[model samples]
Target chain A: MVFGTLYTFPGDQCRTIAIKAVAKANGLDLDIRETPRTPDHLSISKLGKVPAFQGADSFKLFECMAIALYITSQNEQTTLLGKDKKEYAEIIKWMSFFNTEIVILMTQQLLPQLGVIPYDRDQVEFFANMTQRSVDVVEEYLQDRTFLVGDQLSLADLFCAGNISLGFQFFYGKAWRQQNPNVSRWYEMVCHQPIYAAVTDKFQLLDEPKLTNNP
Target chain B: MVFGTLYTFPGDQCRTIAIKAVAKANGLDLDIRETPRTPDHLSISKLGKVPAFQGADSFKLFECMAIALYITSQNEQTTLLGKDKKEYAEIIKWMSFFNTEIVILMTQQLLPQLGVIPYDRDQVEFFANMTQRSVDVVEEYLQDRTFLVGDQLSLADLFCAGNISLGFQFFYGKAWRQQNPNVSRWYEMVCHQPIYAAVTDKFQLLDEPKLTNNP
Candidate 1:
């Protein structure tokens, strides 16, 4: 029986990916449910955000990163967090970088040229330049390593892979992937792991970029 | 004696503030150093970011939030991190919100109009509008509370207050403060606390706004 319920966007949302993946990696029975706006979800997540988890003990938590941390801390056998104090902190640093800087830049860059929102030529290009610079850090870091934090797969890799995967789905396609081989290779490997076996099938990297036609 | 050194923007840098404040709250002797870009510092922070910490024991960690969490977790006696599991997660949620969304929006909005970056009427206004929507969450959360997570002064309060204070220094001003009294008062209280006594003295909220006189 499922011991917890995670309320998030009904289908395969990017933000919802790693949160569920982490729970599965730990062998935790997490019941995934739809996160629709209503008084009930508002009671659980006052901010009306998704991936809110209600544990069997009725302990509720909002915020995706926080909930992921909570699940890891609860499980003693999990190395997904880190091995030592330094590893733990390093894992968080990488996770924070992806969660804040990388994801924000990509989302802003993508939404603009897709005609999803009002697009401005200068601002769109400004964000595009920044996105490349931000991902450059990860590209360089992944050059000599298989994973983000350490030898084993950690939350940093899982969370980062999901967010980066979102970009590949839309903005980052063939040209971007060919240029950034290391991150591309690592993402492909991570998505096919057993952690995501039940979440989704192997995530295909799109060949054509979304904003490629934009000025 | 200082057992740890934090490399970040030297004096009164917003990113360095709460990381030091948390150490003070825990009575940890932390060494805050000027974060300059150099190879030696690069070994500690490969991405060349600030607020990196090197422990006397040779453990090195980068990223502000991770360093702050590390210091608190090291000191078992401090309630600064959290009193329980739920509080711990909530603290991260709040800090992440400020670090990622709120600060990013405010900075993006403030910079362009200041002639610090290329300014666009549409983009500037778009960012300004987003900042209010982002901060509205904090303002409403602080409505009936003295602190962010739980009633006590935790890392959440210290981190949020410092990031929010940056806005008051430049973009947000008298009119903004008057309208957002809840967060304004909360900022006033947190800055004056003993934690920030050594870092900075009562952070005065600017009466005149920076971008106010702009279009």
Candidate 2:
């Protein structure tokens, strides 16, 4: 049974990929559709964001962070949330770190470089500096730690790994790995998992930062 | 017993206020302190964000959106997170909306006007346009709704209300309120609650846009 309909696109939609993987992990039957609100669609998506979820019961939601978390909460079988309260909190922390603090900056840089918006070199430089600081923070945090939150692969890893996958599509390249071994090593381990595969098959690590094509 | 020590400053520390309000709602005893990660403190705070929580059990966390949610998760007595799984997810959605989408833009605009950072009118204008759209969305969403999530006040209301309280302290003035009557009405109602009061005794609504002081 299709329990819900998720309004989002595929490919470079990092958030949509994360939400889709969570739905799959929980075995929540979801209908994946493009983010077009139809007549029957309940009134929502004022921001017109992707990765929005509309439940059959009339419940509606947006924001990839929340949509991903909401799907995880439905499943009692997996500890995708956490083993306990503390771990769960840490999961949320890492997710926020990447979503708000890190990947958004990556998107800011990429949007211009890809010519989706006018290529403003100054704007790209601004976000590039901001993103590097966050990347440094993540690298520091990930030292001697396997997964971002707990010993296991939680939603933190699932969601953030996908966002960072986009980071590779634009920013991080071969030489980038030399400096960021922690997140690099961690990303590879996650790529080996079914959840990671469910999102992108295998998150590609580019040789150099690609600006011509975004995919 | 102070179950945890929350390292966040008071007053204009809006995220800190939201977290504190959640702790009070759950009756969780928290030792409120400054956000200086000490030697004895477990290694964290790479980006050095406020509203970080440190449990006596050696668990530490950052990111106000996550910290507030974490405190709510510990309290089984309250439905601060939400009454159910769907409601919980909606709560997360609103928190992200205010924290990431709305109030962060507010901060970006205010930071320059206050002269704490270089006053880049272009940057302010950019985020100004961004915030107005989100405020419009929240205003539209709250038209027929009471609390952001369920019938009662949830974390969505508790956390987001504080962030908007900061919004009022800076950009949102009488003229702004006239444009956003829905959120104005909702903000007034939430401010009447003990949870809101616990954060800011009285959320001051400015008559004119203040650029002199951030607080």
Candidate 3:
């Protein structure tokens, strides 16, 4: 039985989107308890970050990817994680990659571009290189594959698509996609899934990377 | 059926050390395939980073945290991960925090002081504050707890200890620990674990925070 509301601000926070994708894919009818509506969000997550999950009976879990994993586990019929042990680990591998590499890149490089913080060119270049390095690895992996783990869509593809979409919407422009057609195609497919409508329906690709020269 | 060698570089990388801790705690006898001696490491991990795992069969997995999770899953008898579903999610939560927040902080802030990269004062200060914020959360979490998730030692403690040790060994210093007594106490307990001997055996607490200002 799926119980609890997903505590998050509505929109395309990558991990939040990933969790929503998992919930939607698993057919879990989760409720959304957006922030400021109640102190429950702060009570559950000391960080007060969005996308915390609270069970109907006071059970609460924070961390976006952890919430996604828990949601997927609740449904026995969902193969979104993977089929075999190897595939499951691979799913987690990609998820961890997305969470650590891509997400951190966004925090350092993209967030500053969004004016969340003051910008530094050196910081931007450092994180840009870091982002490209991981993307290059991902592009290489997807060259001969449809999804990250297996033949079917798994949490890896869903989670990564949401993370990569941030690049598409802001950093990675047409030339970036041209160089990594497989990743481009794969992103298109994953975002097109009805499960990711919340993120994709409002998605808009940028003409160039959003960066600032302040400080 | 624990098959394969854990490929890592000759030295003690943090993620590799964390994986080793997990393997040791679970009593999973995984082979260590040291890198630079063979090109297999490059083939398995394009990044050429160590701590890649390859099965005796055709299976291979990269990413240190992923390798750790896979190793834990191979044995159902192992309680290093967690005893229940909720604990398992918390394990992943803390692991993600380690990988994303703490690891990135060290890479961006501490690595520069170690002369691995050019230093920027802005980058150092930015990531230092970031590191402190996350450490504050951990300090609060450890205030009344013996372990991270449950009554017993879990992967969360092991993984987080390895990551936190970086700060202790470079940035946090003795004074830092004095203020964060709960975090300090938790670290002492985790590092004392026999499973973490590879990391803790040579550990030395830093006398002061390392910083650089070239940029």
Q: TM-score winner among the candidates?
A: 2
Best by DockQ: 2
Candidate 3 per-residue lDDT, tens place, A102-190, comes to: 76776677766667877778778788888888888888888889989888988888887887777776666677777778888889888
lDDT, candidate 1, residue A64? 74
Off by over 4 Å in 3: A36-38, A198-215, B9-11, B25-27, B33-38, B198-215
lDDT string for model 2 (A114-192, tens) is: 6677666776888888888888887887899998877889988988887788877766788888879998999877777
Quote the TM-score that chain A achieves in each candidate.
0.91, 0.90, 0.89
lDDT of each: 0.78, 0.78, 0.77
Worst 10 residues of 2 chain A by lDDT: A35-44
Clashes of 2: 0
Supply the DockQ value of model 2. 0.82
What does candidate 1's lDDT look like per residue over A61-156, in tens digits?
777788888877777788898777778888888878887767777777778666787777777787777777878888998898998877999888
Candidate 3 interface RMSD to the true structure: 1.2
**Candidate 2, superposed: residue stretches over 4 Å from native:** A35-42, A211-215, B35-43, B211-215
Candidate 1's C-alpha runs over 4 A off are A1-5, A34-48, A53-60, A171-175, A210-215, B42-47, B56-58, B213-215
**How do these models rank on TM-score, best leading?**
2, 1, 3
| Pick by lDDT: 2 or 3, better one | 2
